[PDB]
Design a binder for this molecule. Structure first.
Ligand SMILES: [Mg+2]
Ligand SMILES: [Mg+2]
Length: 188
RNA sequence: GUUGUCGGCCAUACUAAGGUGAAAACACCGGAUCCCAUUCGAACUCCGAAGUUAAGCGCCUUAAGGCUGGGUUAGUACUAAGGUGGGGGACCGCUUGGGAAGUCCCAGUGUCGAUAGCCU
C-alpha cells in the first residue's frame, strides 16, 4: 500500500496505476561519450513493475537485454489539473485466447492515470483481458474535434440531467446499521 | 624484393580461364656405356648441358565457384527456473535467466619457420 500523490483520498475509487518514464543506456558505459539513451513511457503500479514493463518492451523493440544495459532513471509523471474533465484516447494491444489485437478506447476522467485504470477494469470485464498482456501504444488527451466514441460524445451538453430514479438505502456510518427496521424505506 | 631444401598450422592455401616472369635457383630439356628399371629408358635409375619460360613454379587478374570472418536473420526457433496462468483440448502466453542456424549483405583470400643463397 504505497499511494502516488495524485491518487484520491479514498483508495477505493481508482486503480494503483501510475505513469512512469524510464530511461537507460547500453551497458559498456564509455565515459566522455554521448550515449544513446533509450527512454520509454510505461504504466505500472511500481517502480519495479515499471522496470519490467520497460525491459519487456525494450527487448521486443531492440537488441537489448538487462545484463546488457543499465537503468539511468525512473521518473513518475503527473497530470496537470485535477479540476477539469478530459476525454482521453488510448491505443492498445492485448492478447485474447485466439490472437493479438489493437484497440482504440476513450474515457472521460480527471487523470490519464484514471483513464488507464478505467481502461484496465473495462478490458477485464468486457474483454477478459489480462493486465500483464496489455500494451498501451500511445495516449492522447483529446481535443473535442478529435473525440470519436459515442459514449464519450454522449456527455457533451450543459442541459444534462439525471433524475435519480432509484435510491438504494445506504446508512451513513456503520454506527447506524440495522438488519431490520420498523418501517419501509422509499426510493425518492 | 626473389630462390631452392626440410617444414608447423592444413582452402584466407582449393577449383576455372588469363597476364606477367631481373638475378640466382628449381624445372622443362639432351643421352642410354655404367649401378638400377620396365611390355616399352614413359616412369624408376644413371650421365650430362645443345636449347627453353612453352610447361611445372613465383606474383597478380575476374561486379569469378568454393573456402574464411563479420552483418542481417533475431532477441525470431530452441531452452533454465515459477506458476490455484489462459484454453474442452491441441496448445498459447505471464515473471526471472541463457540464446542459435540458411536465403540475402559486406569484407578477406594463405600464414608462421630453421638453412643456404639471388637482387654487386
Ligand atoms: Mg559464410
Ligand atoms: Mg526462422
Amino acid at each position: 500500500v504505497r499511494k502516488a500523490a495524485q491518487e484520491p483520498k479514498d483508495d477505493t475509487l481508482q486503480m494503483k496505476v501510475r505513469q512512469y518514464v524510464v530511461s537507460a543506456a547500453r551497458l559498456p558505459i564509455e565515459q566522455g561519450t554521448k550515449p544513446e539513451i533509450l527512454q520509454m513511457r510505461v504504466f505500472a503500479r511500481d517502480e519495479v513493475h515499471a522496470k519490467t514493463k520497460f525491459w519487456y518492451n525494450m527487448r521486443k523493440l531492440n537488441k537489448i537485454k538487462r545484463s546488457q544495459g543499465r537503468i539511468l532513471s525512473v521518473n513518475e509523471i503527473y497530470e496537470k489539473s485535477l479540476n477539469t474533465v478530459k476525454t482521453y484516447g488510448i491505443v492498445l494491444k492485448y492478447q485474447s485466447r485466439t490472437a493479438i489485437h489493437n484497440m482504440y478506447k476513450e474515457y472521460r476522467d480527471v487523470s490519464l492515470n484514471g483513464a488507464v485504470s478505467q481502461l484496465i477494469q473495462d478490458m477485464a470485464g468486457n474483454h477478459r483481458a489480462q493486465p500483464d498482456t496489455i500494451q498501451i501504444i500511445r495516449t492522447a488527451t483529446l481535443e473535442p474535434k478529435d473525440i470519436k466514441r459515442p459514449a464519450t460524445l454522449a456527455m457533451r451538453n450543459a442541459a444534462l440531467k439525471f433524475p435519480i430514479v432509484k435510491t438504494i438505502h445506504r446508512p451513513s456510518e456503520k454506527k447506524y446499521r440495522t438488519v431490520y427496521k420498523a418501517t419501509r424505506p422509499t426510493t425518492f
